[PDB]
């Protein structure tokens, strides 16, 4: 929590950091204390003063899950996903995170739980008024993947 907080704290005195730089400091949390990058970005997001901050966070944590530094964190990208189509108004990043995390899902198991995370944040996304072309977008992509998956 110490770490945590000193982050936030730096953040904030430094709101244009680079992502590539920011998200070299998340990933340093993460392997010193042997905690998981999900979890770091669960609780840097209840710490996110604004929403340019928890804005620019969840920026780093997708260019952080691009790098493929730690395995695939299911409930890291289910957060992402919902807090870019729900809070950030960002689809077509968490597209771009649900498609990263197909090309990752190697499982069965993990395959399950992200189908079950994108019709999640579907049925979420459709309980607001002006959500639709987004649940739609998210909707498409997954069934992008299981055609192409039989093709």
């Known amino acids: 929590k110490k770490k945590i907080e000193e982050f936030a704290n730096f953040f904030i005195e430094n709101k244009d950091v680079d992502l590539d730089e920011l998200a070299d400091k998340i990933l340093e949390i993460a392997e010193e204390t ?78 399950e739980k992200l189908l079950k995370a994108i019709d999640e944040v579907i049925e979420k996304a459709r309980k607001e008024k002006g959500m639709d072309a987004a649940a739609e977008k998210l909707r498409e992509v997954k069934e992008k993947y299981l055609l192409e998956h039989h093709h």
């Open 34 to 111: 042997g905690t998981h990058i999900g979890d770091i970005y669960e609780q840097l997001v209840a710490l996110a003063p604004d929403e340019e901050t928890l804005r620019t966070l969840t920026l780093a944590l997708v260019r952080l899950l691009g790098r493929r530094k730690e395995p695939l964190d299911l409930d890291l990208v289910r957060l992402l996903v919902e807090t870019l189509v729900l809070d950030l108004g960002a689809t077509d990043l968490a597209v771009e995170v649900v498609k990263l995390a197909f090309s990752l899902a190697k499982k069965k198991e993990q395959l």
